[PDB]
Design an enzyme around this catalytic site. Sequence first.
Site, short mmCIF file in Angstrom:
data_model
loop_
_atom_site.label_atom_id
_atom_site.label_comp_id
_atom_site.label_asym_id
_atom_site.label_seq_id
_atom_site.Cartn_x
_atom_site.Cartn_y
_atom_site.Cartn_z
N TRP A 102 0.75 -1.26 0.00
CA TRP A 102 0.06 0.02 -0.17
C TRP A 102 0.96 1.32 -0.08
O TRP A 102 0.43 2.34 -0.40
CB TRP A 102 -1.19 0.03 1.13
CG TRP A 102 -2.19 -0.93 0.58
CD1 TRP A 102 -2.62 -2.02 1.16
CD2 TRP A 102 -3.14 -0.53 -0.58
NE1 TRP A 102 -3.77 -2.61 0.13
CE2 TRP A 102 -4.13 -1.74 -0.67
CE3 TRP A 102 -3.31 0.58 -1.51
CZ2 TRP A 102 -5.03 -1.65 -1.51
CZ3 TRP A 102 -4.08 0.39 -2.31
CH2 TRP A 102 -4.93 -0.71 -2.53
N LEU B 50 -12.29 -9.62 -3.69
CA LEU B 50 -11.10 -9.96 -3.40
C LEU B 50 -11.01 -11.22 -2.78
O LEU B 50 -11.34 -11.21 -1.70
CB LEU B 50 -10.33 -8.80 -3.04
CG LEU B 50 -8.79 -9.39 -2.65
CD1 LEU B 50 -8.04 -9.59 -3.71
CD2 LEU B 50 -8.07 -8.00 -2.11
N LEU C 100 -22.18 -4.22 -2.28
CA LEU C 100 -22.66 -5.38 -2.03
C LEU C 100 -21.74 -6.45 -1.46
O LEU C 100 -20.29 -6.28 -1.39
CB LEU C 100 -23.11 -6.12 -3.58
CG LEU C 100 -24.22 -5.19 -4.37
CD1 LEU C 100 -24.29 -5.67 -5.80
CD2 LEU C 100 -25.48 -5.05 -3.38
C1 LIG Z 1 -7.91 2.25 -11.05
C2 LIG Z 1 -8.44 0.92 -11.13
C3 LIG Z 1 -7.85 0.47 -9.66
C4 LIG Z 1 -8.40 -1.00 -9.10
C5 LIG Z 1 -7.76 -1.67 -7.85
C6 LIG Z 1 -8.33 -0.57 -6.69
C7 LIG Z 1 -7.72 -1.32 -5.25
C8 LIG Z 1 -8.38 -2.61 -4.90
C9 LIG Z 1 -7.94 -2.92 -3.77
C10 LIG Z 1 -8.91 -4.18 -3.17
C11 LIG Z 1 -10.19 -3.96 -2.42
C12 LIG Z 1 -10.92 -5.29 -2.21
C13 LIG Z 1 -12.21 -4.98 -1.45
C14 LIG Z 1 -12.79 -6.40 -0.88
O1 LIG Z 1 -12.92 -7.43 -1.77
S1 LIG Z 1 -12.66 -6.50 0.91
C15 LIG Z 1 -12.91 -8.46 0.85
C16 LIG Z 1 -11.67 -8.84 0.86
N1 LIG Z 1 -11.75 -10.51 1.10
C17 LIG Z 1 -11.63 -11.12 2.27
O2 LIG Z 1 -11.38 -10.63 3.51
C18 LIG Z 1 -11.72 -12.71 1.97
C19 LIG Z 1 -10.85 -13.43 2.93
N2 LIG Z 1 -9.52 -13.02 3.09
C20 LIG Z 1 -8.73 -13.33 1.95
O3 LIG Z 1 -8.98 -13.85 0.85
C21 LIG Z 1 -7.15 -12.61 1.81
O4 LIG Z 1 -7.04 -12.65 3.25
C22 LIG Z 1 -7.05 -11.27 1.30
C23 LIG Z 1 -7.29 -11.66 -0.44
C24 LIG Z 1 -7.94 -10.26 1.45
C25 LIG Z 1 -5.43 -10.90 1.29
O5 LIG Z 1 -4.75 -11.97 1.00
P1 LIG Z 1 -3.35 -12.60 2.13
O6 LIG Z 1 -4.26 -12.19 3.43
O7 LIG Z 1 -2.94 -13.76 1.61
O8 LIG Z 1 -2.47 -11.36 2.08
P2 LIG Z 1 -1.18 -11.05 0.94
O9 LIG Z 1 0.24 -11.61 1.40
O10 LIG Z 1 -1.56 -11.77 -0.22
O11 LIG Z 1 -1.20 -9.51 0.62
C26 LIG Z 1 -0.85 -8.77 1.92
C27 LIG Z 1 -1.17 -7.37 1.44
O12 LIG Z 1 -2.68 -7.24 1.20
C28 LIG Z 1 -3.29 -6.13 1.82
N3 LIG Z 1 -4.70 -6.48 1.99
C29 LIG Z 1 -5.25 -7.56 3.03
N4 LIG Z 1 -6.44 -7.35 2.93
C30 LIG Z 1 -6.93 -6.41 1.90
C31 LIG Z 1 -8.02 -6.11 1.63
N5 LIG Z 1 -9.30 -6.58 2.07
N6 LIG Z 1 -8.28 -4.88 0.53
C32 LIG Z 1 -7.01 -4.62 0.17
N7 LIG Z 1 -5.67 -5.06 0.46
C33 LIG Z 1 -5.75 -6.04 1.71
C34 LIG Z 1 -2.39 -5.98 3.12
O13 LIG Z 1 -2.71 -4.84 3.70
C35 LIG Z 1 -0.98 -6.34 2.53
O14 LIG Z 1 -0.74 -5.18 1.96
P3 LIG Z 1 0.57 -4.47 2.80
O15 LIG Z 1 -0.18 -3.95 4.12
O16 LIG Z 1 1.68 -5.33 2.98
O17 LIG Z 1 0.66 -3.06 2.10
C1 LIG Z 2 -17.54 -5.85 -0.15
N1 LIG Z 2 -18.72 -5.71 0.58
C2 LIG Z 2 -19.19 -4.42 1.05
C3 LIG Z 2 -19.15 -7.03 0.84
C4 LIG Z 2 -19.68 -6.72 2.50
C5 LIG Z 2 -19.53 -7.91 3.24
N2 LIG Z 2 -20.49 -8.23 4.26
C6 LIG Z 2 -22.11 -8.75 3.66
C7 LIG Z 2 -20.61 -7.72 5.53
N3 LIG Z 2 -19.52 -7.52 5.92
C8 LIG Z 2 -19.09 -7.24 7.28
N4 LIG Z 2 -18.02 -6.91 7.90
C9 LIG Z 2 -16.73 -7.05 6.88
C10 LIG Z 2 -17.63 -5.88 9.04
C11 LIG Z 2 -16.19 -6.23 9.18
C12 LIG Z 2 -15.46 -5.18 10.16
N5 LIG Z 2 -14.79 -4.17 10.88
C13 LIG Z 2 -20.25 -7.42 8.23
S1 LIG Z 2 -20.42 -7.24 9.77
C14 LIG Z 2 -22.20 -7.58 9.78
C15 LIG Z 2 -22.62 -7.84 8.46
C16 LIG Z 2 -21.65 -7.74 7.60
N6 LIG Z 2 -21.58 -8.01 6.13
#
Ligand SMILES: CCCCCCCCCCCCCC(=O)SCCNC(=O)CCNC(=O)[C@H](O)C(C)(C)COP(=O)(O)OP(=O)(O)OC[C@H]1O[C@@H](n2cnc3c(N)ncnc32)[C@H](O)[C@@H]1OP(=O)(O)O
Ligand SMILES: CN(C)CCCN(C)c1nc(N(C)CCC#N)c2sccc2n1
Length: 411
Positions: free
Chosen positions: A5, A159, A411
Amino acid sequence: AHAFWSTQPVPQTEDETEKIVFAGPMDEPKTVADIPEEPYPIASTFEWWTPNMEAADDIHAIYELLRDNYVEDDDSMFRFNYSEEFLQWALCPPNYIPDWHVAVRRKADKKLLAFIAGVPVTLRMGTPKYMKVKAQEKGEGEEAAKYDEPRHICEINFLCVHKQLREKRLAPILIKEATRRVNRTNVWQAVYTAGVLLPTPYASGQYFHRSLNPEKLVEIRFSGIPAQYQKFQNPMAMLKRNYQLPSAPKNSGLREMKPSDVPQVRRILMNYLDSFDVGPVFSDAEISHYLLPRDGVVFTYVVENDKKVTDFFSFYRIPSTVIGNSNYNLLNAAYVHYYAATSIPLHQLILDLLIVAHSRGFDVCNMVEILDNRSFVEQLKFGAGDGHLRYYFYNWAYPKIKPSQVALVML
Ligand SMILES: CCCCCCCCCCCCCC(=O)SCCNC(=O)CCNC(=O)[C@H](O)C(C)(C)COP(=O)(O)OP(=O)(O)OC[C@H]1O[C@@H](n2cnc3c(N)ncnc32)[C@H](O)[C@@H]1OP(=O)(O)O
Ligand SMILES: CN(C)CCCN(C)c1nc(N(C)CCC#N)c2sccc2n1
Ligand SMILES: [Mg+2]
């Protein structure tokens, strides 16, 4: 602190955020021709894959990755289980770009390892009202107004990295490839949300929940019986009573939205959303896509009396897998979507949302304190949860705003 980041065009600290006074890009102007034509490099044992999110089998492949590896709580009790029908709806709105749906597969045997998705959105993201006043006070109105026009940008969501591949720096690679594909279409900003704190949100709101089936919610440990109810002979009976709802809507002329309602719903929605600093602009085709009822996915009702639509609400369904309970496999949650009220108070409109959701077998209604959601929290018995939803932009400087100035539902 942030090896990825810190290299990206986003505000790096709250202090930096404090100094931002006008909406505008962070990065130098670039052109499509400056952006690499070839995909971002990736390990030789992996490959980029673009699923077709209108094709049942590719939708199913992505659905299984998310079902097993998407967001879960810290105690591993619940994991989101977005449906195949939901994913097609969310990812393929009008004029969507198939290339913005990005996956990684392990080359050998083609196991799916990671996903990220962008969709187009037209967003009002110009300088917010309170900062335009500051600009006027300083003689800086022209600078503050430069980016007032709604912009065609990318919304990022879904993601996901497979649990076996966590903490190997694959998410930054996905992000960089998504950015490249978006930039190759001459789009330079994105909007995204997350529950986690990253550098650096422009707005943050608490999550709220409204119990619809409290017995089930306590059974699965989403909820507990609050301490105050222990003063009663039958705590659970009293809790059920507290959350009881009517069995049929109360508003005369409530009915499901139909195609012919699209122009009036667009009109009343767009007039309402104008009141907020950051919000979407929807065409008729987009109002159709995001609000017409879809079984299992999105539910939308209008109030029509005397041949005129005066109000509407919508909610969408996201079930969660309940990890290891002998009575229940799923938590069925209804999320407050867009709405607009012109004839009745908001609480009276949203009570019908709760009634319909309950009637349809939803267990809880969720929302973030965006829009005017705070206006019906107490009467309708919502309570704050422990989560927050943080709003971010990529490549956009933006003054901090209150969540009641955000009108984009994510969403
Ligand atoms: C112009 C167009 C631009 C388009 C792009 C715009 C940007 C979009 C950005 C994405 C918006 C997504 C919105 C959604 O979908 S939010 C929903 C995110 N998904 C989950 O939480 C699902 C469960 N978890 C996972 O799948 C993994 O833990 C994820 C994939 C989240 C990270 O994989 P992992 O845990 O294996 O880690 P790594 O070693 O590969 O990578 C570590 C790096 O990743 C940074 N990290 C961790 N979590 C997030 C997060 N939620 N947004 C952004 N960055 C995140 C973290 O600070 C670190 O960077 P740094 O701290 O070292 O710097
Ligand atoms: C990317 N996108 C907007 C999907 C929203 C994920 N949804 C449905 C969600 N997410 C929550 N959190 C991630 C809270 C985490 C913190 N701090 C919660 S907490 C209660 C419902 C709920 N639903
Ligand atoms: Mg990783």
